[PDB]
Each structure stands twice: as structure tokens, then as C-alpha cells.
């Protein structure tokens, strides 16, 4: 699998578990088409979203549902979601690891891109 | 004005100058409608996007055109743009400051909400 | 004054008020000597730590007393304090703004150096 | 091993390889005693710094040598090092994963603490 997402909780110092996320891919008509979705495990990671064959070049958006995550922990956060928008595989296949670090009023996102 | 955006460049250690950004409000049909836009100043700030009268409760999105900023610097970036999506709520008097810290493969965003 | 420090709280979405900080300069014997100190204001800022005359080239450390800030809020933190260690260099006229974004198990720091 | 450090480079979107770090432990006389040291591998991780037996309760400091890392890549960064100071094992043994995300003028650090 060439796309993995890892989410961490900066309030608890732990993986962010059961975080839902939705991946979209921009279509020829410039609309966002649903591509894949899932939720993080006990390790805060979401594996198996796609395959090398299906993950063609394109513009992808990973929408991490942070508001639902915080609300279930009793926190009313600032953001609706954390978004990561990027062009993938523009120069051939790559493996992408997207990491998100969450706090109620802030988030950081990092991508590790390997060949 | 109740909304200000500040953008910083973690590669140069400076304000991110001349960064374009577009603000959208979620409409009835669940689509994003243009609301305001501009480019950051020499201080990396964008003031005067809206007014207390126009900035009613709702869901807003701030799209920061980070890829165009890094291309102008000759640095290959990961993200197409940075997005900050949030709900504006009238829980007494409020001012919103959205800060974005940019790096080529990472971004951090923070929201300061004050009375 | 050529050095300013700003501290923000990512749990509350606010300036971090009344945070103590201590600034040190590295001495001849390679030890850290007190140089300046204070507490952040209602805006989360600490101005007037030093002057152009006193702030000569050298290695400085800013220790931000974050654990005491989180204890006052009743939140269990990871770090004892945050540290920012850097060299001040006279490469023409300069102003240094050190920003710190705090969460209980994470911290981010940024330096804006301007002419 | 109850202590692991992972370092990532936000300019390249990759693990930060060959990053040296030194761990210190505060002694009874309030001085920092050398505890362990090593450098990150190709994955940006440093494993095997200590054992459950040697990693007793105390105040530890992980000094990550970021300036040397950036200089070898042709960048003159702001910070001398990234520091992580924390009390370990105060409520019994824990496993600590410290993550640092580096840019030339900024760094973020996160700790995942597990039982």
C-alpha cells in the first residue's frame, strides 16, 4: 500500500484512535470524487486505503475528521477537519506517509515521501 | 474586522509575503462560495478580509495558496494549498486570528480566539 | 529591544498568559548565566527583555516554564520546560521574534528574524 | 528499550538521517550527567539508547544536534539544537517515543507515552 496515515493526540501523548478519514481524488470535471475511507487503529495508523494499481497520478485530499474525534473526548475544538491536499505520483509511483499531530486549536501535518 | 490571517515561512525564518488566500463560506446547497480574498503583506498578515456585520455564524474555509509561494522560491513542495476549515460561533464577542507556519513538506496551523 | 517572545496555548486557543521565562547567555566557562527574565502579558508576549547595546553576539537560551503553566490549568504535561537555544549574529540590522505553541505533550517553536 | 527518538526533515519530506543526539540525566547535585548518545539510522530512528533496568526515574534531557544536521545539507539554521526535557517513570515504568520535526527556523516535538 502506497498511502498510510498516522494521527497523534498532543493532549494525551498517545496515538489518536478511531479517527475517521475520507480520501478524495479530483476528477476531470474539477469535482472531488470519493476515493477511499477508513479509521485509525489502536496504533493511530490507517493502512490498506489503496493499492499501487488504483493509486494513479492525480490530486488527492485526505480529510481527517478531527472535530468528531475531539467531541467524543469532551472537547469542543476549533477545526471541522484537518485537510491534506497534494499531487501524487506526478513523477512515477511513490509511497506516502501522512502524519497529523492534533490539539484542540491547532494541528500539524507532515508527509514522508519515499521511492 | 473579526478575522485576521498570518503566514510564516519556516525555511527563511520570515513572514510569508505575497501569499494569496481565498476565504469561502459554506452555502445552503453545501457548496463553498467565495467570501473574501487577498495577499499577505510585508508582515505576512492579511487584515480587513471582512466586517462584524458580514461575518455571521457559519462554516468557513481559508485556502492558503502555499504551492505558488514555494514555486516562486524555487522549492518543490508537497501540498497544493493549506486549508483551515472552522465554524464561527457567536459565544459572546470574538476575534479570530488564524496562523499558518509553512515548510515544504509540513504545515502547522493555530487559531487564537479572543474576546 | 531586539528580542521578543510570544507564547500560545493550543488547548485553549489563546495567548499563554503569565508564563515565566528565563533567558541565559553562554559564558566563557561554557556555563549558562542569567541574562533576563519575565512573565508573558495578556497578549502572551514578553517585550523589553534586553536592549541593542546589551544583546551582543553569543549563544542564548530561552527557557519557558511550561510545566508550571499546565499545572496551573490542572493539565498533566510531558515537558519540564521548553528550551530555545540559538546564536545571535550581527549580519546587518536584526530583530528576533521567538514564538512557542504549547500543548501538553507537544511544542512547536518558530523564529522570525527580520531586518 | 523504553526510549526511542524519531527525527523527520520538513524540507525534504524524509526521515532525518545521521542526526546525532545526546541524552543527559539530572544528578542529585542538579548537574546534567551524560546518560546515552547515538545517531539516527536511514529510517530517522534511534533505538537501543537504554534498557528498562538503567532507565530509572529522573529528569532527562534529549539534545538533538539539529545545527550539525542542517549545516551538512548547506543550510545555516536558527537553533543550536532541539531539546526535550522531561521527568521519566515518575509513576512507574513507561515507554517513551519522542518525535521531532525539523525545519531551518522551526521545530516541533511530540512524545507518545505508553504503558
Strand ranges (E), chain A: 3-9, 14-15, 20-26, 32-39, 45-46, 58-64, 79-88, 95-103, 106-114
Grid cell locating D91? 509513576
CB < 8 Å to C113, chain D: 78, 105
**Between chains, do A105 and C78 touch, taking CB under 8 Å as contact?**
no
Q: Is C71 annotated as a binding residue?
A: no
Q: What span, in angstroms and rounded, lies between the C-alpha atoms of A20 and B47?
A: 34
**Contact criterion met (CB below 8 Å) for B92 and B115:** yes
Chains A–B, number of C-beta pairs less than 8 Å apart = 51
The residues of A whose Cβ lies within 8 A of any Cβ of C are 9-13, 78, 101, 103-106, 108
**Between chains, do A105 and B108 touch, taking CB under 8 Å as contact?**
no
Contacts of B73 (CB under 8 A, 6+ apart): B11, B12
Q: b/e for C12-43, b at 16 or more Cβ within 10 A?
A: bbbbbbebbbbbbbbeeeeebeebbeeebeee
Chains touching C, CB cut-off 8 Å, 3+ pairs: A, B, D
A104/chain B closest Cα distance in angstroms: 9
Q: What span, in angstroms and rounded, lies between the C-alpha atoms of A6 and A45?
A: 4
User: Which one of A57, A86, A89, A90 makes the best mutation probe of the B interface by having the most chain B beta carbons within 10 Å?
Assistant: A86
Centroid of chain to Cα B57: 17
| Pair type for strands A3-9 and A14-15 | antiparallel
Total domains present in chain B: 1
CB < 8 Å to A13, chain C: 78, 104-105
User: Which one of C6, C101, C110 makes the best mutation probe of the B interface by having the most chain B beta carbons within 10 Å?
Assistant: C110
Q: What span, in angstroms and rounded, lies between the C-alpha atoms of D48 and D36?
A: 10
CB-count burial class (<10 Å; 0-12, 13-18, 19+) for B1: middle
Q: Is D45 annotated as a binding residue?
A: yes
- In terms of C-beta distances under 8 Å and separation of at least 24 residues, what long-range contacts does D64-68 make, across chains too? D64/D5, D64/D7, D64/D19, D64/D20, D64/D21, D64/D100, D65/D19, D65/D20, D65/D21, D65/D22, D66/D19, D66/D100, D66/D102, D66/D107, D68/D20
Size (chain C), residues: 115
Q: Which domain holds residue D115?
A: 1-115
DSSP code at position A49:
S
Place of cell 519556516: B10
Chains B–D, number of C-beta pairs less than 8 Å apart = 35
Residue in B62, B2, B1, B68 with CA at minimum distance from that of residue B36: B62
**Between chains, do B103 and D103 touch, taking CB under 8 Å as contact?**
yes
**Between chains, do C105 and A78 touch, taking CB under 8 Å as contact?**
no
**Contact criterion met (CB below 8 Å) for C82 and C70:** no
In three-state secondary structure terms, C9 is strand
Grid cell locating A89? 505520483
Q: What span, in angstroms and rounded, lies between the C-alpha atoms of B29 and A26?
A: 20
**Contact criterion met (CB below 8 Å) for D66 and D93:** no
Write the secondary structure of B9-25 as one string of H (helix), E (strand) and C (coil): ECCCCEECCCCEEEEEE
D76 to C87, C113, D71: CA distances (angstroms): 11, 13, 6
Q: What span, in angstroms and rounded, lies between the C-alpha atoms of D14 and A41?
A: 24
Q: What span, in angstroms and rounded, lies between the C-alpha atoms of B55 and B49?
A: 10
Method: X-ray
- CA dihedral for D81, C98, B108, B80, sign (positive or negative): negative
Give phi and psi for C69, each to the nearest 5.
-65, -50
Size (chain D), residues: 115
**Between chains, do D101 and A111 touch, taking CB under 8 Å as contact?**
no
- Which helix (H) or strand (E) segment holds residue C68: the answer is helix C66-72
Bridge partners, D32 (sequence order): D26
Residue in A95, A3, A112 with CA at minimum distance from that of residue A48: A3
Place of cell 457559519: B58
In three-state secondary structure terms, D72 is helix
Q: What span, in angstroms and rounded, lies between the C-alpha atoms of C26 and C53?
A: 17
Place of cell 509553512: B102
Give phi and psi for C46, each to the nearest 5.
-130, 110
Amino acid at each position: 500500500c502506497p498511502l498510510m496515515v498516522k494521527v497523534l493526540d498532543a493532549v494525551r501523548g498517545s496515538p489518536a484512535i478511531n479517527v475517521a478519514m475520507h480520501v478524495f481524488r479530483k476528477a476531470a470535471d474539477d469535482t472531488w470524487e470519493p476515493f477511499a475511507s477508513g479509521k485509525t487503529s489502536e496504533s493511530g495508523e490507517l493502512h490498506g486505503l489503496t493499492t499501487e494499481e488504483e493509486f494513479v497520478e492525480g490530486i488527492y485530499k485526505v480529510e481527517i475528521d478531527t472535530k468528531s474525534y475531539w467531541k467524543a473526548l469532551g472537547i469542543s475544538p476549533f477545526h471541522e477537519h484537518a485537510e491534506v491536499v497534494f499531487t501524487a505520483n506526478d513523477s512515477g509511483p511513490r509511497r506516502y506517509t501522512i502524519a497529523a499531530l492534533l490539539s484542540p486549536y491547532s494541528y500539524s501535518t507532515m508527509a514522508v515521501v519515499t521511492n
